[PDB]
Each structure stands twice: as structure tokens, then as C-alpha cells.
Amino acid sequence: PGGDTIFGKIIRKEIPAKIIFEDDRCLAFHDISPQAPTHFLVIPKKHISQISVAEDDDESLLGHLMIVGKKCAADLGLNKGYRMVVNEGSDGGQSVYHVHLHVLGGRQMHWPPG
Amino acid sequence: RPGGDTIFGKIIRKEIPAKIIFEDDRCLAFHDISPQAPTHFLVIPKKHISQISVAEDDDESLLGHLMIVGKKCAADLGLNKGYRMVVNEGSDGGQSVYHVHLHVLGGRQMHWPPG
Ligand SMILES: C[C@H](N)C(=O)NS(=O)(=O)OC[C@H]1O[C@@H](n2cnc3c(N)ncnc32)[C@H](O)[C@@H]1O
Known about the structure:
HIT family, subunit A; 5 strands; 24% helix; thiol protease (chain A); deSUMOylase activity (chain A); HIT-like (chain A); hydrolase (chain A)
């Protein structure tokens, strides 16, 4: 039912988050530890633990996260650009085992991306 | 032209060389010429879309397909300890090629923040 992580609790409305957008299949909310003046997450309501286990049937859902992300970025006034990030596993620095798309902007993002 | 005018269109049409990892009717995965990690490749759509900010609602499946291909290529390249996927948009994102693309980086510990 949204999974056994803190992101599951956020989806179920059991703990608060600053929600930017919601539909029947995803949720966008500001990150609690922001790394840029604007830093939010877009997550599926379906509990996919990590991108490495995403199924072929999840393709449109994953793309939906990116479309919602870019729409939210526009709504939040990120007209100079932004960066989207998905972390996988220990080397990727994945902090919660529920797939999440980071969207960061409001400052120059640098290279390399970590 | 199929693939667009950028250097990535040239790569799609085999007009300039690339080290290709995977190719299908919708996308192409190839190694980055300036790797920022021991493994660093790009997944790009064969349809030209300039940047994620102008992607259309009907591009959802294609965008998701980039991610699925990214994760499959990462597995095939033995990135078993993980990796980071990145899309750069515009000036603040550090985008230098205006053809939508997904970076996949691995083979070392990635740090936070992601730039
Ligand atoms: C460099 C800038 N920070 C950047 O990341 N720009 S980008 O988001 O648009 O990424 C484009 C990527 O395409 C790569 N690239 C450019 N020309 C290439 C070529 N002929 N073959 C393979 N990769 C190429 C660049 O090294 C860069 O990592």
C-alpha cells in the first residue's frame, strides 16, 4: 500500500510533507533536505523499490514522473533550468528504497553531478 | 532530418562515430566522450526533443523507455553497486547539447549534492 518506507508514509498522508502536486499515480513534494533553492521529488504511488527493478510495463509511469517534474518546475518558476536525478543503490547514493525523481534548480548546478 | 540537427542526430544517422551500447527503434545508448565516472553513458531518443522542458504529454512512454533502457544497459555493463541517472535542462542545468538525453554514471561512489 505505497510501501514500508518514509515515502510510503508520505503517500498515505501519515506524516506531513509540502505537497506540490498529486494525481492518481504520483506525488510531488519538496525535499526535507534541500540541496538547491528549489528541490523537490516526484514519486510513484506504486512501490517500486529502485529503478533497477522497474518492469517494462512501468515505462509510461516513469515517463509520467518526468512530465510531472517538468510541469512542476515550470510552475515553481525555474525558467533558467534545472537538473533531474534518479539515484540507484549504494554507489548512486540512493537514500530511500522507493523510486524517486529529484528536481533541483534556482542555482547553477555543477559538473560532475556528484 | 530523422534525429535532428545536433551532434546527437549525426550520431543517430551514423555520420559521426560513437561507442554504441544499445539501439532500438526509439532510442540509442552510447558512451560519453568526456566521462565523469568510470562508466558514463547517454541514452537518447531517436525523435528529436530539444530539452525536457518542452517534452509533450504524449512523450511519456518514450521518456520512460529511456530510463528502462538506461537501467538495462547499466546491468549489462555490470554496474551492480549502483549508478546515478541525470537529465540536465537549460543554463542552470548545465545542458550543452539541446537534444534530450539521460546520463547514466557509475563505477564509483557518487556524492551529494549532485552538482
Ligand atoms: C558538459 C555539460 N555539463 C553537460 O553535461 N551537457 S549535457 O547535459 O548536454 O550533456 C551532453 C553530454 O554529451 C557528451 N558529448 C558531447 N559530444 C559527444 C560525442 N561526440 N560523443 C559522445 N558524447 C558526447 C558530453 O561529453 C556531455 O556529457
